[PDB]
Design a protein around this ligand. Structure first.
Ligand SMILES: *[C@@H]1O[C@H](CO)[C@@H](O[C@@H]2O[C@H](CO)[C@@H](O[C@H]3O[C@H](CO)[C@@H](O)[C@H](O)[C@@H]3O)[C@H](O)[C@H]2NC(C)=O)[C@H](O[C@@H]2O[C@@H](C)[C@@H](O)[C@@H](O)[C@@H]2O)[C@H]1NC(C)=O
Ligand SMILES: CCCCCCCC/N=C1\OC[C@@H]2[C@@H](O)[C@H](O)[C@@H](O)[C@H](O)N12
Length: 493
């Protein structure tokens, strides 16, 4: 049954939806379309229908589908299961925990199909650890998963998979290696692996990845992909305040070529995809050129992961678009995003419409430039945006209010849902052209069954009447209200 949003305002531009132990909000014909609408004024994925008409006339804005122009296939959408997300979720009563996970992972919720999992601690942990902290354990004999994995992350990831109808892909990323493998002997700061790729430090580090995949397999979890390192550029930066491990693109190239690729290929986990970069898109296309023009590294790289944080410095055509033109067979994937990280921003703005529009504007732009997936950061945080051992607080689509056993679903959650619920793995992006200049962001995709989905974000405050033309089925006449977001679905059969 469709239970509606319980709105609550916290003084910002829109409302959150209040969920608790007993209550959370939840969820065509032919010649007919469905519309799902979310507005700043408070509408939350509201369903409505309309006719696909045969003829159309007028000089209004027209968006024409080009279903014969086929682009990338979609891997999917989801978020990260950090220690911080696990702690917050486990601090609710079990019925409330089930409503939180169902929100994300079930068909009654928004159908996430990706989960990013940090390999040992990052800033969103309450302590500083790796899986092999015993000094000079080159053998990795004292390699083990702490309670953070065995009592927190793993059981939650299981509950998620149990609630999913869609098959879920796990993605793993390390922030730092054991400190005895690092030039600087610390989890943070400027510092990289000692020595040079091909050597004992590097074979050990590669072996750790396999050790990690082995331990997760023992608990019956398998990975779709790993990244070669979270934000390699970080550890190049003097003073870096939290867990990091620096690689120049050359160093990453040679690590993948001589150590990490071979070690994964020779393992039971040879089907695991390796993704490179896992950093700002401004580093593209340079990094892809350095890594992929080496045939010894190229043969191990399935794809390129990007983070959104310096987007403003890096227009998508010159970065994502140029990477696709040079390397069309190496998928681009967005693996981390969050709002509220800028020193001047308040970490959590409960009910922020603006932050929701940032998510959807990013997903659309990324999809228009060949990106196959998009992953949020922390699945849930507290009202302060934590916890986080260095107070690097940020926002999250779900905020958990522990002392009240309630959690808030923010507009980011819905802007995300507009994609994740209606764009399953295997969907494919198709062309869409606009009849004239406009302030909308729009993308069209084809489901595996051939049915259409179109998402329209209105970045301006003015209501925009428009028409969507599907070349051999008809016309959808609709209105896109100011600031709103719409998903349209229709069968082309
Ligand atoms: C979990 O959240 C739910 C939904 O928000 C809480 O229950 C709801 O409780 C509200 C008010 O407590 C209730 O309200 C209306 O009717 C009033 C009289 O006509 C009117 O003046 C008022 O403003 C409300 O519009 C609403 O009907 C109800 N929602 C549903 C569908 O249940 C729930 O609360 C607690 O559990 C039940 C038994 C509830 O009715 C309260 O009496 C309880 O204290 C939340 N749980 C907790 C722990 O807060
Ligand atoms: C500037 C980057 N801003 C960030 O904002 C927060 C987020 C970090 O939590 C994450 O661990 C990093 O990968 C990333 O750098 N993050």
């Amino acid at each position: 049954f469709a239970r509606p949003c319980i709105p609550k305002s916290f003084g910002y531009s829109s409302v959150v939806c209040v969920c608790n132990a007993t209550y959370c909000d939840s969820f065509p014909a032919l010649g007919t379309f469905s519309r799902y609408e979310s507005t700043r004024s408070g509408r939350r994925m509201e369903l409505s229908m309309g006719p696909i008409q045969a003829n159309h006339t007028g000089t209004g804005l027209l968006l024409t589908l080009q279903p014969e122009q086929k682009f990338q296939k979609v891997k999917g959408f989801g978020g990260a299961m950090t220690d911080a997300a696990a702690l917050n979720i486990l601090a609710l009563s079990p019925p409330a925990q089930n409503l939180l996970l169902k929100s994300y992972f079930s068909e009654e919720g928004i159908g996430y199909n990706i989960i990013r999992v940090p390999m040992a601690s990052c800033d969103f942990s309450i302590r500083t650890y790796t899986y092999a902290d015993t000094p000079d354990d080159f053998q990795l004999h004292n390699f083990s998963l702490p309670e953070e994995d065995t009592k927190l992350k793993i059981p939650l990831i299981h509950r998620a998979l149990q609630l999913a109808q869609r098959p879920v892909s796990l993605l793993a990323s390390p922030w730092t290696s054991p400190t005895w493998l690092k030039t600087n002997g610390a989890v943070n700061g400027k510092g990289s692996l000692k020595g040079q790729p091909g050597d004992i430090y590097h074979q050990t580090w590669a072996r750790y990845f396999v050790k990690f995949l082995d331990a997760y397999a023992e608990h019956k979890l398998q990975f779709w992909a790993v990244t070669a390192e979270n934000e390699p550029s970080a550890g190049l930066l003097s003073g870096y305040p939290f867990q990091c491990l620096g690689f120049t693109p050359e160093h990453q190239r040679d690590f993948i070529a001589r150590d990490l690729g071979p070690t994964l290929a020779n393992s039971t986990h040879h089907n695991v995809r390796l993704l490179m970069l896992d950093d700002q898109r401004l580093l593209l296309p340079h990094w892809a050129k350095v890594v992929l023009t080496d045939p010894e590294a190229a043969k191990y790289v399935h794809g390129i992961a990007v983070h959104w944080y310096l987007d403003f410095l890096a227009p998508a055509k010159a970065t994502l678009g140029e990477t696709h033109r040079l390397f069309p067979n190496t998928m681009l994937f967005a693996s981390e995003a969050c709002v509220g990280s800028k020193f001047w921003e308040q970490s959590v703005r409960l009910g922020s419409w603006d932050r929701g529009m940032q998510y959807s504007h990013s997903i659309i732009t990324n999809l228009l430039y060949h990106v196959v997936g998009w992953t949020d950061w922390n699945l849930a945080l507290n009202p302060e945006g934590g916890p986080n051992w260095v107070r690097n607080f940020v926002d999250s689509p779900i905020i958990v209010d522990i002392t009240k056993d309630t959690f808030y679903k923010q507009p980011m959650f819905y802007h995300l849902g507009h994609f994740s619920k209606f764009i399953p793995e295997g969907s494919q992006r198709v062309g869409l052209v606009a009849s004239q200049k406009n302030d909308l962001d729009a993308v069209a995709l084809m489901h595996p069954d051939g049915s259409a989905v179109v998402v329209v974000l209105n970045r301006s405050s003015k209501d925009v009447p428009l028409t969507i033309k599907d070349p051999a089925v008809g016309f959808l006449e609709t209105i896109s209200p100011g600031y709103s977001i719409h998903t349209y679905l229709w069968h082309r059969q």
